[PDB]
């Protein structure tokens, strides 16, 4: 019986905020992934949160990568207005991401709950395969401040006082002229790209401090959205290398390897950097040149994310990071 902490402050101070609580797990072997099917009493969503089955291109590396059109369950592949229509009905969302070497798979489970349930949902249980997990809500004595290493921090609207706060981002795959995210990538990083080698359309949705209204990325006139964009794309490998007990970095960087996405591809659509040892970097991403978000799972591989060259690349699905915000204490 594991535990996941949902951090509730005493008050919310208006705003349609959702709280996020996530925790990682001890691992399981490689080929066990498909067995994982979660049950819950606090998924609460209309068959959309837990029942996330997605067409992936499993890249089994050997030796030598093997692309296979596989189907995965429980991933954090989010959809348009998912958080929103979850909020209006006071229902929840839950997903998990994976960091996998050639042999093992460390999970990371996020749960997203509207703040309208810091009192109703005081405790809960959710089971994922070999692990039960009690979802424990936990009150801090903060009014609305997020608890950051002993102090209650409160954005915004003010000398100025400013700190760095945690933020969780998930990619939402939506198609339309207004979602050409790679165009913003080019306009704000001066990489040598164009619109055909990079066609995936979508955006990111993020929550800050475990209690915040969602932040869409990118939007030009949002201070926090552009902060998140800078953070996400200056470290797409995730701004937290160290998973639960991986400070002594043993990255057997095996090296670059090509793969098809999907398996039926005529040539190699994705470049990767195979590794082994300790799984710390996430293993779920999305292929870039495909208009449809053709999701990719890569065990024992760091997919190519550096967009210095604008072809045969991938973008992360989830991302946990830190960005700068103005606040107050006492």
């Amino acid at each position, epitope marked *: 019986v594991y535990d996941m902490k949902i951090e509730c402050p005493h008050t919310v101070s208006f705003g*349609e905020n959702s709280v996020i609580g996530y925790v990682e797990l001890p691992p399981m072997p490689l080929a066990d992934t498909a067995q994982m099917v979660p049950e819950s009493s606090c998924s609460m969503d209309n068959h959309q949160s837990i029942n996330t089955i997605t067409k992936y291109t499993q890249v089994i590396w050997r030796g030598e990568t093997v692309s296979t059109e596989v189907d995965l369950k429980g991933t954090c592949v989010l*959809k*348009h*207005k*998912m958080v*929103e*229509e979850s909020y209006r009905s006071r229902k929840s969302i839950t997903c998990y991401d994976l960091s996998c070497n050639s042999t093992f798979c460390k999970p990371t489970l996020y749960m997203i709950v509207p703040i309208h349930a810091c009192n109703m949902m005081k405790s809960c249980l959710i089971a994922l395969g070999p692990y039960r997990v009690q979802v424990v809500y936990e009150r801090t004595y903060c009014m609305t401040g997020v608890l950051i290493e002993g102090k209650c921090f409160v954005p915004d609207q003010s000398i100025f006082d400013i700190a760095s706060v945690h933020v969780v981002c998930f990619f939402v*795959a*939506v*198609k*339309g*002229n*207004t979602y*050409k995210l790679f*165009e913003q990538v080019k306009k704000s990083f001066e990489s040598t790209c164009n*619109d055909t080698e990079n066609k995936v359309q979508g955006y990111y949705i993020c929550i800050v401090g475990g209690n915040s*209204a*969602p932040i*869409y990325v990118p*939007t*030009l*006139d949002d201070f926090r959205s552009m902060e998140a964009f800078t953070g996400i794309f200056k470290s797409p490998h995730g701004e937290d290398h160290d998973l639960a007990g991986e400070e002594i970095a043993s990255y057997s960087i095996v090296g670059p390897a090509n793969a098809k996405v999907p398996h039926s591809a005529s040539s190699d659509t994705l470049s990767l950097i195979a590794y082994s040892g300790i799984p710390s970097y996430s293993s779920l991403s999305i292929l870039t040149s495909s*208009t449809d978000a053709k999701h990719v799972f890569s065990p024992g591989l760091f997919p190519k994310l550096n967009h210095t060259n604008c072809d045969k690349s991938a973008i992360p699905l989830t991302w946990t990071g830190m960005i700068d915000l103005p606040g107050y204490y006492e």
Partner: antibody
Amino acid sequence: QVQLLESGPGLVKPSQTLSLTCTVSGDSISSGGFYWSWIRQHPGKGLEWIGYISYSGSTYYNPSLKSRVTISVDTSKNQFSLKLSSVTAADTAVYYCARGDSSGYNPLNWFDPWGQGTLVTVSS
Amino acid sequence: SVLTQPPSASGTPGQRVTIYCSGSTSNIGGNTVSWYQQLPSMAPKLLIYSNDQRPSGVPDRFSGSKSGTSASLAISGLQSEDEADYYCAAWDENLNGVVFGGGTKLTVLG
């Protein structure tokens, strides 16, 4: 690429019920989360939004035409439909279907993309 | 048409042509404006959303803005192919719907 396409009879006689159907392509209609909308435009005149429906069944009609407008949905077949009852010579217009979106949390804000429209003329 | 647009605006290439859209607190005071360009006898096309944002394939000649209950579309650097009809749209809560402006017939003279 995502495209919307309208279909229906070009002529509908007075005091009938007018039915039109918009079909989505490129995007899965259940991956939408969008406000699927009917808008019209009288000849030489401006624009007027008829109504919208969500992928669940939320019927949000214009107060002027909520008496007459009905909007069908078909999630299993990627379609939605408009049914304007009690049509007269006033309702002759170009009818467009649109994928209205709402950026953040507030309701309908913009329409992207558009179907290329269909001209429904009314005359006995 | 609850949103009030000027009927016609005009200019010559190289201008800064601005198109207006005035409503009340119930429509533009609390919700975003989107801007649409309709070419001669054609289906409309999104130009601005969220009051200033640009779709892909939209030139920053077209910028937008909104203050209080009134919005503007600024074509900074007018060009020949901009001879069309420009509509503004926003959500009105007291009417619980989406409202358009009267359109703006833009003429490129010279």
